[PDB]
Amino acid sequence: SAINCDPNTTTSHQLLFGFGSPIVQSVLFDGCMLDIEKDDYGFVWSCLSNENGDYCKGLYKPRFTQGVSPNWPMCDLSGASAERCIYPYCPEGEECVP
C-alpha cells in the first residue's frame, strides 16, 4: 500500500518494537519521519508480555518538517531498539531481514 506523510492526518501509524524497549520518540519510516503521539495522560505507547507473546507498540504521526535523513540505528522489533531509529520497511515483493 501507499504511505501517507501528512502532518495534519487523522490516521496514525502503528509501530511494533521489541518488548522492553524505552518509549521510542521518533522513527524514519520509508522516507517519512514520524513522531510518537501523545495522550492527555502521556505517550500513546504500550508494552505487553504474556505466555502467548510480547511486544512494544506506539502510535506515530508525521512531523511538520521532513526530508532530513539523520543517522540512527535500525529499530529493533524483538530487542531494546533505542529511542530514535529507522524502521525496517519491506516493500511488497521481497525478503527483508536486516
What approach was used to elucidate this structure? X-ray
C-alpha cell at 50: 504474556
The domain containing residue 49 runs over which residues? 1-98
Q: What share of the chain is helix, strand, coil (3-state, %, to 5)?
A: 0, 35, 65
CATH of the domain at 53: 2.40.30.280
- Identify whether the C-beta of residue 87 lies closer than 8 Å to the C-beta of residue 28: yes
Residue (of 72, 9, 65) closest to 32 by Cα position: 65
Instruction: Please state the domain count of the chain.
Output: 1
- Identify whether the C-beta of residue 89 lies closer than 8 Å to the C-beta of residue 29: yes
Task: Say how far apart CA 74 and CA 2 lie, in whole Å.
Answer: 22
Residue (of 87, 90, 30, 18) closest to 57 by Cα position: 18
Q: Please give the resolution of this entry in Å, rounded to 1 decimal.
A: 2.9
Over its C-alpha atoms, the chain yields an Rg (Å, rounded) of 13
- Identify whether the C-beta of residue 32 lies closer than 8 Å to the C-beta of residue 3: yes
